[PDB]
């Protein structure tokens, strides 16, 4: 099998290139690894080049993917931008061929940000509508809200865009108390925070 | 015939390369008060021809207020079939059951590192009958230590990870649930596990008066079923004949008790034979708040002398021990603090001399602060001095106050404080700040001003350790009341191999010589300040022996013209093996051509190999082939034949990735 | 016995993506050779996909989806490309519910799927490729 080095890749602004580890643990296997970067909307974008785009991995061999930068400093410097790093592993074999695409997040993080990453998750606020819940995110970071419980019931994870809001379904009988967890840069759930309404 | 977890077959171990070696460690001390200059140069030679490992040590001293002294020489080797080694020449004994002595002769000892990481230490084997196919799950402290599926019939699991004291392994088959508690003593062995240290030669000691007699110190620790561990030995020599025998046991919940009786017929330099005995107990108990009680008792009978005492000079030269009780308690108060209560006691034959050595300690990890309170009562009846020392160490990292994303260099700094009260009026405190400075975290400043309380002279220090890509250096200054020392040391390592001489950081046994021709100044991953030379070779200071290491080149630091084929390589080295991990550094323009043929993009998967410059690349999609190391001209061969020409303007060299479009024939 | 000094250990631990391993090696699902009405299905063929070497935190929030070349006759069935015509490959979940292809990722440590031939008729060699995309939230 093939497994990526990290679940999310933080790209600092101005850095020439970033690396992502592609591992293979099966000795008797040949995998053609194809890679590309999509924009936030799932459309292929040529602003980030992943080299080598296509290469073959024989045996227990792991390579490093060099994510080159081609934006020419056009993304906003006051908020993060989200990109989707895609890695497809074609097995170099009436049969059905299965190719796995391990899509991960790729945050383009500008150098100068007011809020530190750790002190940004707790700044998320809440607003309870009649049958929907709105999450205000004044921090310039993308926030991944998981394990979102509104009372005794569990809601669906929402990815709140920076300086924006998202909406999730909210049952009418759910308790007023709201608690949430956020996934940090390392892919580990932060300690439980209480949800202060607005 | 199931293999153990993490098993590297003995067919993948690399003996190394026929390469030389030279490790030098200079040191200087320009004390000022009349100023005396010191210099202690240290040379460690080597020559790894074939599978043998010749070594050598040499020191040169100097004093301003010139003598080459030889120290050691040995030809170590690894005998893979017997899972052992051969330390022909100088060396020292393990001294596990006996007492360690330095010798000059052959030694054939079993090596534990050659076994996988799983079959190390003590961990009981799990037997039993599992009717039909099931899934055994070893439950311990509510954790799945070992989760596997078992075929019908009896099953043996011997790869349980050594978890120290811990608790009980509740085996959960699927459903006869039987528990297997276990404890450990350092001298216990797994089932079927054997060790031996057959030795010979002379007895070499630093003292001048001691003689150099022949001796034969053989040992053996054969594990048995049910946890018993029969271990014996024989330190037979010319005038000293010992026969150590012992038997350990894993009693499960009750703990583990190791007993060994040692009879030694010694002939002291007065030509007076002295028969004796010696009985040693090691008791280990755990999880009684988790009081880890360790008791060690060693009784002796008058006339029992170790080999170090029967090797003295004759009568014209110029109080054997009776019992040594050691008690150790480690209680964890909470999830941060751990209280230590060590203990020691001793008697002597014919005298009431009692050498008590009681040591307490309270170590805490309050948030970032790691404050340690310590207590010591070093008591010797010969001096009748309590020597009570109450020390308080503190450690306040600067990250506790600074931001997390701050670019300031202070983020690596970490303050400190070492209060040291002697309970006699003498007080000593050193309040200093240390941490790394340079961008690559090489340089380490440690300015630590200090004061002493009755003299009242302040004690200043400022060490500057630099762990560079060629050799460590440090210019450490030290100021006191009337002493103004100024250290200056230079380390390094030279590795003269087949392709040339390459300098590097001080070698630590196993080394890895990375060969990357054409790539200059590329940092290797997970190593502080290790960079390739101008030729492209670098020397890794250390690599784990008999394991699978990982050597990688940080692609960020590579030049704008160098692209690597495989940026990660793994090496499995034998002990003392200069293993070569080689990378191909393709130098040239990285161009991403949109290859087309008959106004249709080439099929996905088509191979494109250049002609003028060696390069290759598969066509990703729509004809975007990523060719590295290509010159400003040349042709490409498309095979899926077709040949395409491209012409790069001279401006292409500046651009990191020069995209072009070439129509194939 | 003399006091030493403070020693600080530094390092960072990062998570990793679950490595994908099918029970049938080389990620190949054999279907064998090749319907009174259009839409009838053939003998079921099972294959398993194991998400191993990852913690249960990541493996629970992985969004699974399917992509593939939609058949010309049936947009919701994988096309088979001497080649059998008017047929395709359909994917059914463990519960027996059809899994539409080219759909937004949905939240599903081991995943069982069944591949069945669906008629959209001539026999022949039928080869299809499926993209199994895992979004790591």
Numbering used by the authors:
A (entry chain C): 1 to 93, 101 to 205
B (entry chain D): 121 to 153, 157 to 188, 196 to 304, 310 to 423, 426 to 455, 478 to 613, 617 to 802, 809 to 833
C (entry chain I): 7 to 40, 45 to 91, 95 to 121, 129 to 140, 144 to 160
Paper text:
Uropathogenic Escherichia coli strains use filamentous type 1 pili to adhere to and invade uroepithelial cells. The pilus consists of a flexible tip fibrillum, formed by the adhesin FimH and the subunits FimG and FimF. The pilus rod is a helical assembly of up to 3000 copies of the main subunit FimA, terminated by a single copy of the subunit FimI that anchors the rod to the assembly platform FimD in the outer membrane. The assembly platform FimD in the outer membrane of uropathogenic E. coli is the catalyst of type 1 pilus assembly.
To explore the structural implications of FimI-mediated termination of pilus assembly, we performed a FimD-catalyzed assembly reaction of pilus rods in vitro similar to the one for the FimDHGFAnC complex, except that excess FimICHis was also added at the end of the reaction. Using Ni-NTA affinity chromatography, we separate complexes with a terminal FimICHis subunit from complexes with terminal FimAnC and determine the structure of the FimI-terminated assembly platform at 3.6 Å resolution (map XIII). To identify structural parameters explaining assembly termination by FimI, we next analyzed the interfaces between FimC and FimA (model IV), FimC and FimI (model XIII), and FimC and FimF (PDB-ID 6E1422) in the respective FimD complexes. While the interactions between FimC and the respective subunit (FimA, FimI, FimF) are primarily mediated through backbone hydrogen bonding involving the G1 strand of FimC, differences emerge in the interactions with FimA strand A’. In contrast to FimA and FimF, FimI does not only form hydrogen bonds with the neighboring A1’ strand of FimC, but also with the B1 strand of FimC. Here, Arg25 of FimI additionally interacts with Thr23 and Asn25 of the B1 strand of FimC via hydrogen bonds. Indeed, we also identified a closed P5 pocket in the FimD-bound FimIC complex. However, when comparing the usher complexes with FimA or FimI as the last incorporated subunit with the usher-tip fibrillum complex (last subunit: FimF, with open P5 pocket), we found that the P5 pocket was closed in the terminal FimA subunit as well as in FimI. In any case, a much stronger binding of FimC to the terminal FimI subunit compared to a terminal FimA due to a larger interface and a higher number of inter-molecular hydrogen bonds appears to be critical for assembly termination by FimI.
